[PDB]
Amino acid sequence: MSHIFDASVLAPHIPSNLPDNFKVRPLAKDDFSKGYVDLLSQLTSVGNLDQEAFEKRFEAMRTSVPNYHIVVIEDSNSQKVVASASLVVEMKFIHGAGSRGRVEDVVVDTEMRRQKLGAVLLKTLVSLGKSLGVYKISLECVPELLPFYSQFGFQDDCNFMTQRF
Amino acid sequence: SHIFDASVLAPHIPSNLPDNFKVRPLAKDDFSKGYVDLLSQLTSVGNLDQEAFEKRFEAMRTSVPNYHIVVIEDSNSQKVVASASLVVEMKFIHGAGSRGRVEDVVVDTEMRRQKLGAVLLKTLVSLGKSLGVYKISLECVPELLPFYSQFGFQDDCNFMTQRF
Ligand SMILES: *SCCNC(=O)CCNC(=O)[C@H](O)C(C)(C)COP(=O)(O)OP(=O)(O)OC[C@H]1O[C@@H](n2cnc3c(N)ncnc32)[C@H](O)[C@@H]1OP(=O)(O)O
Ligand SMILES: *SCCNC(=O)CCNC(=O)[C@H](O)C(C)(C)COP(=O)(O)OP(=O)(O)OC[C@H]1O[C@@H](n2cnc3c(N)ncnc32)[C@H](O)[C@@H]1OP(=O)(O)O
């Protein structure tokens, strides 16, 4: 039904190099029925997420400002969501009330990999976050993904700490 | 106008800190208590005047999850001398879980090595656990390992960044 953010803000950022069966768009409320939770399960554990919790969380995200820019790719051949990536923006006071962007939950369906859907999403989100005015954008991942992330500007960084246990 | 609720902060503030220090949420009038001069000791604050401060503070105060910005005010100067933020990212993964990030940690240069930084980290790790976050992280510099290792944190280089 509804989109998690306005598809008009995303439109200028979507590249043009994907086959016509791919549609890049905001997550939508009825993407549960399009396999979104199955997609997330390929990334990590979804725990007890079910459709009611998915819809409630989707509403909470949809009313947030800055928006949760959760961008998906729907394969029109199957009408399933086959890729997802999130650009989440934290408001700051530093840098003149600037914004700090993070690219999270990046996943492409395992059968659909090496068709460029991953690069399309990271390119779209990097362009969206620059346009939004973010001063710093980051990705938490293993950069075995070296070739991949660097061509969009990301550099290895170790100014990040997690808990030991 | 407080950025988040003092009653939520209360159980996580450690005991018997010296009495010239008050640990509390960031307040809209903290601009007049030297908040910008404190943040400058962390990085460029740009042209953050009172009007822009207040516009941004209100945008953050109405966001859910809240921006858990905790500051320490010193009596002996009536100035904000320390600040740290716990910012919470909603997820769908982990049962519509939530991810906590400790950010913008800074103690005024004249007030360092009096445990203010430690109080802020203990407070925010305890508050993040209460909020039910499944993972918490810190962004800091590796040179400061002898500080952050005291609150469970260790360096994690599965991270990439760029400045625009
Ligand atoms: S932690 C953040 C990343 N998310 C995950 O790691 C979750 C699981 N992995 C994925 O969902 C996908 O494997 C990701 C990493 C999102 C990649 O998506 P795509 O497969 O759609 O990537 P592209 O087709 O756009 O790939 C472009 C370039 O990526 C490099 N590359 C991808 N995968 C590999 C592997 N497996 N081994 C070596 N290199 C890989 C290549 O430079 C690739 O260009 P090619 O023309 O495909 O060689
Ligand atoms: S996450 C940090 C990113 N922020 C900054 O880099 C901003 C500039 N730095 C600061 O604001 C302060 O130096 C920080 C890093 C916030 C620490 O604040 P405090 O000065 O209040 O620290 P504590 O008194 O709580 O220190 C507790 C123990 O941590 C170690 N420690 C603090 N500072 C250092 C330095 N610079 N180098 C090595 N260790 C440091 C000490 O073990 C300290 O215990 P002592 O009992 O003082 O030795």
**Domains of chain A by residue range:** 6-154
Q: How many CB atoms lie within 10 A of CB B73?
A: 19
Nearest listed ligand to the Cα of residue A102: 1
CA distance A149 to A139: 9
Cα angle, residue A94 at apex, residues A90 and A99 outer, rounded to 5°: 30
Q: How many CB atoms lie within 10 A of CB B145?
A: 14
Question: What's the number of CA atoms in the CB half-sphere (13 Å) around residue B73?
Answer: 15
Cβ neighbors of B7 (< 8 A, separation 6 or more) are none
User: Entry resolution in angstroms?
Assistant: 1.5
Residue B107 in contact with residue B118, Cβ under 8 Å?
no
CA distance A51 to B45: 42
**Cis peptide, bond prior to residue B65, ω within 30 of zero:** yes
- Token reading at B112: 């360092």
Question: What's the number of CA atoms in the CB half-sphere (13 Å) around residue B116?
Answer: 26
CATH class of B5-153: alpha beta
* Phi then psi dihedrals of residue A135, to 5 deg: -90, -20
Q: How far is CA B89 from the centre of its chain?
A: 15
By what method was this entry solved? X-ray
| 3 state DSSP class of A22 | strand
Query: Which residues' Cβ are closer than 6 Å to ligand 2?
Result: B 42, 105-107, 112-118, 140-141, 144, 146-147
Burial of A111 (0-12, 13-18, 19+ CB in 10 A): exposed
Q: Which chain A residues touch B135 with a CB distance below 8 Å?
A: 162-163
Strands B98-107 and B135-138: parallel
| 3 state DSSP class of A162 | strand
* Phi then psi dihedrals of residue A154, to 5 deg: -80, 145
- CATH 3.40.630.30 for domain A6-154: yes
Q: Is A86 left (phi over 0), alpha (psi -120 to 50) or beta?
A: beta
| 3 state DSSP class of A131 | helix
Give me the DSSP letters along chain B.
Answer: -BSS-HHHHGGGSPS---TTEEEEE-BGGGGGGTHHHHHTTTS---S--HHHHHHHHHHHHTSSS--EEEEEEETTTTEEEEEEEEEEEE-SHHHH-EEEEEEEEEE-GGGTTSSHHHHHHHHHHHHHHHTT-SEEEE---GGGHHHHGGGTEEE----EEEE-
Nearest listed ligand to the Cα of residue A142: 1
> For residue A107, which of A138, A83, A80 has the smallest C-alpha distance?
A83
Q: How far is CA A55 from the centre of its chain?
A: 18
* Phi then psi dihedrals of residue A161, to 5 deg: -140, 140
CA distance B34 to A147: 45
CA distance B1 to B37: 20
Separation of B122 CA from ligand 2 center, angstroms?
13
| 3 state DSSP class of A78 | coil
